[PDB]
Amino acid sequence: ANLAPLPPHVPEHLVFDFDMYNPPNISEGVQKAWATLQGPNVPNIVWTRCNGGHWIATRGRLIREAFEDPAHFSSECPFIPREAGEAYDFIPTSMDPPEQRQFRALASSVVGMPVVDKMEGHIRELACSLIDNIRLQGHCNFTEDFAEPFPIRIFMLLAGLPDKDIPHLKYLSDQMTRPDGSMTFAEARDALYEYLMPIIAERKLKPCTDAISVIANGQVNGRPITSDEAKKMCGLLLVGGLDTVVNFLSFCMEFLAKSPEHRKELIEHPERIPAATEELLRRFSLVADGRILKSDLEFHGVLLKKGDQILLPQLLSGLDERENACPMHVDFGRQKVSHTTFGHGSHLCLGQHLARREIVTTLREWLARIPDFAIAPGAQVRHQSGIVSGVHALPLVWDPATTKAV
Ligand code: HEM
Ligand SMILES: CC1(C)[C@H]2CC(=O)[C@]1(C)C[C@H]2O
Ligand SMILES: [K+]
Question: Which domain of life is it from (predicted)?
Answer without folding.
Answer: Bacteria
